[PDB]
Amino acid sequence: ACFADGILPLDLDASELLSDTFEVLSSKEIKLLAMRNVVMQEAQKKLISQVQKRNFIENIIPIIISLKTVLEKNKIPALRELMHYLREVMQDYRDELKDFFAVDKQLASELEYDMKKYQ
Amino acid sequence: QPIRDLTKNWEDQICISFDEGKTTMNFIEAALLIQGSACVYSKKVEYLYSLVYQALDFISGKIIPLLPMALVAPDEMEKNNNPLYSRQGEVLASRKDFRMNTCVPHPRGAFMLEPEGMSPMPWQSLDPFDSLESKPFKKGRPYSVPPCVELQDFHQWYLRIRDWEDTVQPLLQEQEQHVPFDIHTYGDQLVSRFPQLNEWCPFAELVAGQPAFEVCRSMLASLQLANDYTVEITQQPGLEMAVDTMSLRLLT
Amino acid sequence: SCLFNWNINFIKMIHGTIKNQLQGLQKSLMVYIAEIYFRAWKKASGKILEAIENDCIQDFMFHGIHLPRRSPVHSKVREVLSYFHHQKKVRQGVEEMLYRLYKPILWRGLKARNSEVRSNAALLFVEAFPIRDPNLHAIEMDSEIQKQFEELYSLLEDPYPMVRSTGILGVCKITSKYWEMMPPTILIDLLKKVTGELAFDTSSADVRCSVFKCLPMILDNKLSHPLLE
């Protein structure tokens, strides 16, 4: 939110801030080991996992759109880290994220195209 | 209930308490008031799984390295056995409270806490998004105009919508220079057109010489004065011969 | 064309073969191959044609964006793509499939920080204009033309001089071709922008020479002769 405020001076320093926070966000270990009576506990763990990750997505997407807009406006070199992290966000969910990114605009088509390139 | 199938796509006598335990509810009542709860549909379905899991639980219910030795506090009786006192003679601390007593000499003269350990001695493509030198736009004159006046040498050189507008628009201007019509002033004017108040005289004669729109405004004023029960219209009895034979009689 | 129609799976080995053998053949042979692939698209239909749309042309233009200009094959790639941009007017519906092809890949190519790949993106863009989507309404027509307006505005406000020069020549071609289509306020604003500022760009002389390369082919505009005068 402090990044997407724009009150910060966005520069090469802020390029390094954004970029290394992107590989903080794109770490493998940021997700829980639970999704990586006891079978019922596993069941409720992954249902909790779907609801927290969809809450996380609906929180992040407006501020992602704002920060990517001002980031491409400044030609900040962390945009490759943007399209790095956002695509592992895209290999979380295959079709319902395409529906939520059909609610969003001008981001999905490049995402299916890179995903096709990854296969 | 699509979620009931979606619980079944995985694979009543119970009391469920919403919130913090204040409310008491039966399962058929609890699940159905929460199906219309004060959340977004994604949050509502989330709460609905948590209810199914909490109810189902109740239905089912019925490496280490060596430790450094200096990390251990010494025994209290030992510290009583060697106390350290002050210039005034009062006991201030113990001797084991400080670590130079546990320092170990070296042949070089060094002191370490742990003697155990190491002693000191053609189809490739461009990479995208590479900023290069962008020479910015700068404004100025590359040009010079010398007026030297207001000198040559030879040897150097020697070597129906339109119809609709035309039909209807003059009528629109004709409406714009229509006479301004106010109901009270026109009613008083039509009354003054009569020789005297409450006198029968042909109203067609009084509107004779007026244009068609003024005649229609006059009969509209007559109709309004008739409908307000103030002025009485006297027409000929019948249907078709009553035309142009009305007369205004100003009763009130 | 019917060898392409025969086996869908053989098309990727065809793609590899034509990847291997672009260097040998000449410019007329390149536009001949481009005619072959145009008729190959035209005869194709169905899921094989959909796989060809998701297989061949987007990879060629992706390469032509990303190939260095040092490579001689890069010249062949954008000349056959310019042939395709010339043939899009001949057949109707070609504009829509290239729009749905270029919905991912034109837009980030516009803001490509590297000057060469953005220069190639501008080279395809200036002939790409206008882009049409048939099903969209008049609000979306005005929105997409205003989007192209601000896109060419930013592309002519580029800091690099050669990207500016390509943008100049492109809007010269635009103002020559379809000056009747744009609103007059937009036209007056763009001509004032490219005349009051651009003629005195002391950073580079050849950008003003590119404006000079533009000036004869705007002079066909009969109605704007007092306005340019």
DSSP string for residues in chain B = -HHHHHHHHH----EE--TTTT--EEHHHHHHHHTT-SS-HHHHHHHHHHHHHHHHHHHHH----PPPGGGSPPPHHHHHHSEEE-SSS-EEEEGGGSTTTT-EE-TTS-EES--SSPPP-----PPS----------B--------------SHHHH--HHHHHHHHHHHHHHHHTSPP--HHHHHHHHHHHSSSTT----HHHHTTTS-HHHHHHHHHHHHHHHHTTSEEE---SSSSTTTT---EEE--
**Distance between CA atoms of residues B131 and C111, nearest Å:** 12
Residue C201 three-state SS: strand
Resolution in A: 7.5
Query: Cβ distance C204 to C161 under 8 Å?
Result: yes
Cβ pair A40:B129 closer than 8 A: no
Q: Does the beta-carbon distance from B126 to C71 stay under 8 Å?
A: no
Q: How close A32 comes to chain C (CA, Å)?
A: 33
What residues of chain A lie within 8 A of the CB of B60, using their CB? Answer: 37, 40
Torsion of CA B220, B225, B229, B233, to 10 degrees: -70
Select from A92, A90, A91 the least CA-distant residue to A108: A90
- Interfacial residues of B (vs C; Cβ cutoff 8 Å): 122-132, 134-142
What are the two backbone dihedrals, phi and then psi, of residue A47, each rounded to the nearest 5 degrees? -65, -45
Place of tokens 């297989």: C55
Q: Which token pair is B89?
A: 């003679």
- Chain C neighbors of A77, CB-CB under 8 A: 113
**In terms of Cα–Cα distance, which of C140, C141, C204, C215 is closest to C171?**
C215
Closest CA to C219 of C160, C179, C164: C179
Q: Burial, B200: exposed, middle or buried (Cβ in 10 Å; 0-12, 13-18, 19+)?
A: exposed
Q: Do B139 and C161 touch (CB under 8 A)?
A: no
Integer Cα distance of C67 and B124 in angstroms: 7
Residue whose C-alpha is closest to residue B130's, from C161, C115, A79, C162: C115
DSSP three-state, residue C67: coil
Does residue B26 contact residue B16 with C-beta atoms inside 8 Å? yes
Q: What is the C-alpha separation between A64 and A69, in angstroms, rounded?
A: 8
Tokens of A46: 């992954």
The answer to whether C111 contacts chain A (CB < 8 Å) is: yes
Q: What is the DSSP letter of A9?
A: P
Rg of chain C over CA atoms, in angstroms? 19
Residues of B in contact with C113 (CB under 8 A): 128-131
Cβ neighbors of B245 (< 8 A, separation 6 or more) are: B202, B204, B235, B236
3-class SS of residue C99? helix
Q: Where are the alpha helices (DSSP H) in chain A?
A: 2-5, 12-25, 38-74, 79-90, 96-103, 108-118
Q: What b/e string do you get for B10-46 counting C-beta neighbours within 10 Å, with b at 16 or more?
A: eeeeeebeeeeeeeebeeeebbeebeeeeeeeeeebb
Distance from CA of A29 to the nearest CA of C (A): 31
Q: Is the dihedral of CA B76, B78, B84, B88 positive or negative?
A: positive
Strands B248-250 and B111-112: unpaired
Which residues in C137-172 are b (16+ Cβ under 10 Å) and which e? eeeeeeebbeebeebbeebbebebbbbbbbbbbbbb
Q: Do C203 and B137 touch (CB under 8 A)?
A: yes
- Distance between first and last Cα of chain C: 53
